[PDB]
Amino acid sequence: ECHEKAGDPVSLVTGAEILTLNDVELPNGFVWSRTYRSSKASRNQGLGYGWRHAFQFELKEVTDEKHNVTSWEFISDSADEIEFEPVEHGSTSYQVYVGASCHFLNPNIRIVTLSSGDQYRFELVEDIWLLKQVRNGIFSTFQLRYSRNHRLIEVAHNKRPVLECQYDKQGRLVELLNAKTEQVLTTYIYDEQDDLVGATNDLGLTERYEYQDQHLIAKRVRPTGFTHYFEWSGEGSSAKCIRNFGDSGIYDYRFHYEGAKSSYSDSLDNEWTFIHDEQGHLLEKSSPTGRTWQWHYDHLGRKEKAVFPDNSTTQYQYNQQGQLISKLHSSGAQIQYGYDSLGKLVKTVSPDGDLEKAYYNSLGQRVWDIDALGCVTEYEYDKHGQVVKRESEDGKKSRWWWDKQQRLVAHEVDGTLLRYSYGATDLVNGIAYPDGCVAQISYDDYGRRTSIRYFNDEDKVGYSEEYAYDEFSRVAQIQTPEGVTSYQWGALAQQEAVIFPDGSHISYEYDQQRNLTKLVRSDGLAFEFWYDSEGLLSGTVGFDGLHSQFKYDSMGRIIRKDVADRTVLYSYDDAGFLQHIKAGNGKNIVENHFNYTLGGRLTLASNRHQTLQYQYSSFGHLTKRIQGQFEIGEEFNRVGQRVSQTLPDKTSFNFSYDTNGRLSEIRFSDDSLPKIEFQYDVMGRLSVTETESFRESKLYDGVGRLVEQQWSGREKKYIYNAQNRISSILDNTAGATHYQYDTLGYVTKVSEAGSTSTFESDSFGNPALADSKVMSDRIEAYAGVRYKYDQQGNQVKREGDGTVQKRVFDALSQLVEVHGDSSISHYEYDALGRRTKKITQNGITEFLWEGERLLGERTADGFRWYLYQPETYIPLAVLENGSIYLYECDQVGKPERLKDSAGNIVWSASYDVHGFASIDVEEVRNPLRFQGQYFDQETNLHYNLARYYDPKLGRFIQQDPISIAGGINHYQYAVNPIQWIAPTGFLCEEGLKRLQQMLAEYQAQSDVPQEVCDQILEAAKESSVGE
């Protein structure tokens, strides 16, 4: 038995049907669900026959005729029973092969700690044990109260009631109140028979249920529609449900029994086999493709060994207490857990040798937390049992404030101290930031968010955002200052269509089993998907072809891509990691080599051009980077911070942190270079950079947008339009630039001098100039330049004004050579996909990488290192020939000015709208154009991390391996290069991130849904492997 689309996973071979539905959900951790069970559907308590809410716990005490108890029965959801033996006071039961325990604190207090991590504190009143505490999480608890009659009412959230039960005089519940501005939420409906028939949700949704003859579910009708039918072949609790009819996306679900095995059909003619023993123990599970899972028990009720489809075994080892002690994998490492006398997880050992432990108080509070890297965290609770401090080592201590109503009044992380304010109900309507900004939220009468309005005093800045929902439960329209966006769902949360401004529409066509089949745009181009019998992506077709194969393994891992020209031939370590990659295109082999240890920490990535060996000392932190003939060390502190990074040039600059755990001082070891100091803002943003000869200060209007920059001799101001876009840039050194955009985010025209520039484009980023010529998505002619592509979709030939340039790549779609008129260049890449050596006519250039960003280079004239911001890719204070040169970057991070510590500027340049830089004063070269971009002059290109960007055309010259998961346009760099940085190539984002942007709700729409996006990301491992 297993999961099916027309219901819930089956819990018994006899055909026990389960149905879990959530009635109400609160956005603070509260939920009210219900569970139905076809088996044992002859008892009625609370709801109808078989229905049970999540707060029904009895803990009965079984008695016999001899006036002896000898048994305590604990009943949980889905009719699960556990038997505990009677013990004396101050002792526990230590139940076997279930992993539970029954602690007896006092004669009226019991604690039932299950294997999940709950406590279930029960209290005796006169003769029966009623549930009083749940403690389903670390901070989420549930308090229960009872009246003179034994009925559950007044459910609370750790201090305060948020729901009711409103029991009826008949003996059931019909309506659920709110205990605060009382209003109907569920209004259960009952017929003359004792069985749940109608739901009648608060928003008007009515879900009907009809039982055939014996309170067994025969049909169910959702409020939107797509009813589901049921048929049975037995009587009573021994009835086997067969032929589960579906109507939304499924149309066939057959179940066949044979007494010893069970076969399950599907709507795509796919059957799974299940073979059980004489009991409910699952022995074998067979897939229609050939994958077989096997289980072997220890003749005690618990599992002992598991066998996967591949030739591997996983064994378990318990103790005399019935808890899981160790789990060992075949030809690998093992995991070891350790519990306390109560039965909660207290210690866990990782396969890499890093232990994680904690401590639980006598009231369930967790204190003295220690992570894997090593950090003592001290928890502090108030009189009401809520964390107030959560203090770690070296700052990183939060602060929480509560009122008489025990509501979140103030929360602090690193010094923000933002305040919250609630309205007339238990919902926060106002947020006050320490910079003066105030964000108000306006809701509707159904408790949903409708409007958000930001406003700041003494500056007159702010905007608004609005949302409009659909008929039943979905979002229909979102109105932002940029524009309006509409959505159309397929009555099953599928979003059949999305509508973007300027008349843009994207349609999604699904198929059976609810799989994304086709994505159609407005111009007729379609992206097609094809799945196999296993539900995985078996093929993809882009807007211009590019067929794929996507071969998988017996465990669910991709083996080869084979996208119409070249396979990758992935080879795994046979333990859970990648080992080898061999790609080929026209007699071109790369032969990458990967080595991994038990639990990560590869420490090795071998290639034909590099070695890339790493070293770890202790606590799981890296301490040595050995790249080719270069060695970089580290001096990680006992608290986890890193200081005194040693370089092969014997520089070894030291770091010094301050309160709240932030970088505050950088002191070189040369004893001749001055130190650079940083000063952050109350909001947590870097504001001042101070040095004896360089003072930089960036200001903010009070909302989170950068407005003014000063460098003690030069000032830059930015003026935004009504659409929250950079409109005017005024530099103190005789400069005024104005931008004008279209209805979308693209730029239409720019004016910087007596001459102006104009651009035209459609709603998909393609150029719409008078001389632009594109076939489907690639540019064939632009500004008199002819581009000749290949079968893959990469710029191969470029014909400009009397100049022809050819480009040749490798089998990994990486540019390896470029031929021109008199300049032939070659490039070398390592196993991580980064450029390590450049061979040109000028000389040999070597690059050193530190993670994802570049760190220094060697141009055969000495050593020069590049420094960046603490947590930003903006370069600053480059070190060369024992001299520090300070940079001056704009709001995007493009270095335009560079000056030594003497008062005179040594490098000056100016950038255009397309990213090209015209240099006028050049004494010290600066090949950095954007954040993480390297500028090649011999080819006049930009290289972020794996792709070449063209500053003249304004977009990349090749498609990324996650093009479908990145955006609708495979060549678009960004919608506008004024507010987007897009580091490391793909995955563009905003350059400046504001804290107020976290309050806005999710857009609930993407270019590709999460499932297909994850399936695409997992299918491309050659570009996602790192450290």
Q: Which residue has the tokens 């919902």?
A: 427
- Residues in the chain, overall count: 1027
The C-alpha torsion from 919 through 921 and 922 to 926, rounded to 10°, is -50
Residues 948, 898 contacting (CB under 8 angstroms): no
Yes or no: say if 364 and 612 are a contact pair by the CB < 8 Å rule.
no
Q: CB neighbours (10 Å) of residue 737?
A: 16
- Residue 226 tokens read as 């797509």
Structure tokens at 959: 């498609």
What CA–CA distances, in Å, run from 21 to 24, 186, 199, 201?
9, 12, 10, 12
Task: Tell me how far apart the alpha carbons of residues 283 and 221 are, in angstroms, rounded to a whole number.
Answer: 35
- How many DSSP H helices and E strands does the chain contain? 2, 90
Q: What is the distance between the alpha carbons of residues 950 and 942, in angstroms, rounded to a whole number?
A: 6
* Cβ pair 400, 386 in contact under 8 A: yes
Neighbours of 44 (CB within 10 A): 15
Whole domain around residue 429: which residue ranges? 394-462
Tell me the residue type at 940. Answer: N
Q: Residue 294 contacts by C-beta under 8 Å, 6 or more apart in sequence? A: 283, 284, 285, 306, 307
Solving technique: cryo-EM
By the 8 A CB rule, do 993 and 979 touch?
Answer: no
DSSP H or E stretch at residue 1015 = helix 1010-1019
Give pairs for 588-596: CB < 8 Å, separation 24+: 588/810, 588/811, 589/811, 590/810, 590/811, 590/812, 592/831, 592/1022, 593/831, 594/831, 594/1025
Q: How far apart are CA 838 and CA 579, in angstroms?
A: 27
CB 34 within 8 A of CB 20: yes
Closest C-alpha among 185, 188, 186 to residue 168: 188
Classify residue 155 as exposed, middle or buried by CB count within 10 Å of its CB (0-12, 13-18, 19+).
buried
Task: Report CA-CA distances (Å) from 588 to 398, 772, 813, 932, 948.
Answer: 55, 35, 11, 29, 20
Phi, psi of 827 (to 5 degrees): -135, 155
Identity (one letter) of the amino acid at 923? E
* Bridge partners for 905 per DSSP: 899
- Tally Cβ neighbours within 10 Å of residue 254: 13
- β-bridge mates for residue 339, sequence order: 345
Residue 796 within a domain? no
HSE at residue 580, side-chain half, CA atoms within 13 A, is 7
Q: How far is CA 861 from CA 404, 498, 648, 845, in A?
A: 69, 56, 15, 10
Q: Give the strand pairing for 160-163 and 155-157.
A: antiparallel
Distance CA(210)–CA(312), nearest Å, equals: 47
CA angle 986, 989, 991 (to 5 degrees): 125
**Dihedral pair phi/psi, residue 1015, rounded to 5°:** -65, -30
CB 255 within 8 A of CB 263: yes
CB 489 within 8 A of CB 498: no
Return the HEC string of 234-280: CCHHHCCEECCCCCCCCCCCCEEECCCEEEECCCCCCCEEEEECCCC
Three-class secondary structure of residue 549 per DSSP: coil
- Collapsing DSSP states into helix, strand and coil, what is residue 775? coil
Nearest to 143 by CA among 153, 774, 293, 786: 153
User: With b meaning 16 or more CB within 10 Å and e meaning fewer, what string describes 484-495?
Assistant: ebbbbbbbeebb
- DSSP-derived secondary structure for 401-447: EE-TT--EEEEESSS--EEEEE-SSSSEEEEE-TTSEEEEEEE-TTS
How many distinct structural domains can be found in the chain?
Answer: 1
Number of alpha carbons in the 13 Å side-chain half-sphere of residue 608 = 9
In which residue are the tokens 């019935």 written? 322
Does some domain include residue 938? no
Q: In this structure, are residues 644 and 662 in contact, taking their beta carbons and an 8 Å threshold?
A: no
| Beta-carbon count within 10 A of 149 CB | 7
Q: How far is CA 989 from CA 109, 648, 891, 976, 982, in A?
A: 54, 34, 14, 11, 6
- Of the candidates 18, 246, 210, the residue with the CA atom closest to the CA atom of residue 254: 246
113: β partners: 101
Return d(Cα 596, Cα 165) in angstroms, integer.
55
Cα distances (angstroms) measured from residue 72 to each of 52, 698, 808: 21, 68, 76
Cα-only R_g, the chain: 33
Return the SS3 of 69.
Answer: coil
Please measure the distance between the N-terminal and C-terminal CA atoms of the chain and give it in whole angstroms: 40
CA distance 782 to 787: 8
Tell me if 414 is assigned to some domain: yes
Residue 948 tokens, joined:
């070449």
910, 926 contact by CB (below 8 A): no
Name residue 964's amino acid: I
Q: Are 526 and 519 in contact (CB under 8 A)?
A: yes
Nearest residue to 965 via CA among 924, 929, 1013, 1005:
1013
The torsion of the CA quartet 811, 813, 819, 823, rounded to 10 degrees, works out to: -110
Instruction: List helix spans (H) across 603-682.
Output: none
Residue 346: half-sphere exposure toward Cβ, Cα within 13 Å = 13
Q: Which two tokens stand for residue 863?
A: 């050593």
- Retrieve residue 442's tokens: 């306006």
DSSP 290: S
Dihedral angle, C-alpha 295, 300, 302, 305, nearest 10 °: -40
CA–CA dist 532, 573 (Å, integer):
26
Please tell me the distance from the alpha carbon of residue 785 to that of residue 567, in angstroms, as a whole number: 33
| Strand stretches in 511-572, DSSP E | 516-520, 526-531, 537-541, 551-552, 558-560, 571-572
Q: In whole angstroms, what is the distance from residue 763 CA to residue 522 CA?
A: 9
Does residue 191 belong to any structural domain of this protein? no
Query: What is the helix (H) or strand (E) element at residue 1011, kind and residue range?
Result: helix 1010-1019
- CA dist 356 and 307 (Å) reads 28
| Cα–Cα distances in angstroms (integers) from residue 626 to residues 384, 644, 850, 862, in the given order | 53, 17, 11, 20
Which SS3 state, helix, strand or coil, does residue 120 take? Answer: coil
Phi and psi torsions of 849, nearest 5°: -110, 145
Q: What is the spatial distance between Cα 594 and Cα 600, in angstroms, rounded to a whole number?
A: 12
What tokens does 79 get? 């009719």
- The answer to whether position 429 is within a domain reads yes
Q: Which residues of 162-193 are buried (b: 16+ CB within 10 A; e: fewer)?
A: bbbbbbeeeebbbbbbbbeeeeebbebebeee
Residue 238 has phi, psi (to 5 degrees) of: -95, 20
Q: How far apart, in whole angstroms, are the C-alpha atoms of residue 746 and residue 994? A: 22
- Rounded-to-integer distance, Cα 443 and Cα 452, Å: 9
What is the amino acid identity at position 620?
A: G
- 551: in domain: no
Half-sphere exposure of 573 (CA within 13 A, CB side): 16
Q: What is the DSSP letter of 648?
A: T
- Give which of 791, 315, 188 is closest to 544, Cα–Cα: 791
The partner residues of 1007 in beta bridges, in order of sequence, read none
Q: Please state the φ and ψ torsions of residue 879, each to the nearest 5 degrees.
A: -110, 120
What span, in angstroms and rounded, lies between the C-alpha atoms of 748 and 758? 6
**Is residue 148 situated within a structural domain?**
no
* Phi-psi group of 77: left, alpha or beta (phi > 0 → left; psi -120 to 50 → alpha; rest → beta): beta
Contacts (Cβ under 8 Å, ≥6 apart) of 212: 218, 230, 232
CA angle 216, 222, 225 (to 5 degrees): 125
